[PDB]
Amino acid sequence: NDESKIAVLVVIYDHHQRELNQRMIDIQHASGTHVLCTTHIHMDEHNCLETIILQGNSFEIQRLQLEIGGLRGVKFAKLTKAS
Amino acid sequence: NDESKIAVLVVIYDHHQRELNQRMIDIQHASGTHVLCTTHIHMDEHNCLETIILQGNSFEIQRLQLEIGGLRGVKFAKLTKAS
Amino acid sequence: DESKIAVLVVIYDHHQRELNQRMIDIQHASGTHVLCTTHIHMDEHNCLETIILQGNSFEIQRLQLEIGGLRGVKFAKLTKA
Amino acid sequence: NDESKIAVLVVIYDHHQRELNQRMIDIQHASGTHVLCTTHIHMDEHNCLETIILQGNSFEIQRLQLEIGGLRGVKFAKLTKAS
Ligand code: NI
Ligand code: NI
Ligand code: NI
Ligand code: NI
What we know:
The structure is a homotetramer. The first copy, chain A, contains 2 helices and 4 strands; from the N terminus they run βαββαβ. By secondary structure, chain A is of the alpha+beta class. Bound molecules: nickel (II) ion (4 copies). The PDB classes it as transcription.
């Protein structure tokens, strides 16, 4: 794209999954200003929910989505695209 | 239904609308949802983004979503059913 | 002139006429100084906010005195880092 | 009377540090405090800031704080006591 957008990626994962947290955070740190913040909810022993606020064009954003959303031990990864 | 469910309500609204932040907060205090928390981004002079994280039976989540969505100044008020 | 990050922790009563407008107006007119806010609705008359702030120690302290002095704020403490 | 209370724990840490993100998350899931939520700012390549919002008695909170305070790679870990 070029068109500048805001989005939320809602994630459910198990933090017991070996190296998952390391991957998700390295992806977000390596993505520059694309990631505004994350809010985390410790649901139970094997479920975390995260809302990851994202900003950029539609293509940068879906790509971030697919990176985080494909990792092993991610149960659920859904984009809400806003503007 | 009769159980525990997690949802994320994603809202974009105009904080220039008279009383709007105050009404959105009160709807949340008054609700028999347990709102776990709300994260807010001041996107610009006319746009705020909130991710409101909710727990409850579907009826109450849905009542929250409609009630927020029915406020003048809300531009976008979309729910992600997670859980 | 050194850029720093800070958390302003606020408790206030949302039933206070116009406190919410004033707080959000301050933050919106503060440019890139506010990163985000996280809100917990404690009970009928208490909200806790965690307001995350970025700038020099002066710009930050001002921001603090601005939110911090509004009528209806019970508590306004700054963590510097 | 019985004394469940609110606190904010503010943490700066190095996400490069070997499995620090997993361990902090793990400490949070395993504690007897109610962690309401964690907000995370990716500050730069070596710095993450978290705001951990907590509810419980002063003992379990102080336990959480000292425990996060003692992981290698955590750089700053101040509690703010609320009510
Ligand atoms: Ni968790
Ligand atoms: Ni705003
Ligand atoms: Ni509130
Ligand atoms: Ni980070």
